[PDB]
Amino acid sequence: MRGRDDDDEENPRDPREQYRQCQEYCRRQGQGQRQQQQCQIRCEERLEEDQRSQEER
């Protein structure tokens, strides 16, 4: 774009902290490699999904 948009800018909140939370939850509850992929994937979309929503308030 001619100017600078906010889509290419990182959100003020740290996504890593909540991402780490998913990893702890998944390991604590669940069994098998297949489930490990399932918990990480769901959290990944949600993580990106959360930033799109934006909550400045």
Q: How many CB atoms lie within 10 A of CB 13?
A: 12
Indicate the number of domains in the chain.
1
Domain that holds residue 43: 15-51
3-class DSSP state of 50:
helix
Q: Is 26 exposed, middle or buried (0-12, 13-18, 19+ CB in 10 A)?
A: middle
Asked if residue 57 belongs to a domain, the reply is: no
Asked if residue 10 belongs to a domain, the reply is: no
Asked if residue 35 belongs to a domain, the reply is: yes
The letter for the amino acid at 29 is Q
> What approach was used to elucidate this structure?
NMR
Q: What is the DSSP letter of 54?
A: -
The letter for the amino acid at 48 is E
Asked if residue 3 belongs to a domain, the reply is: no
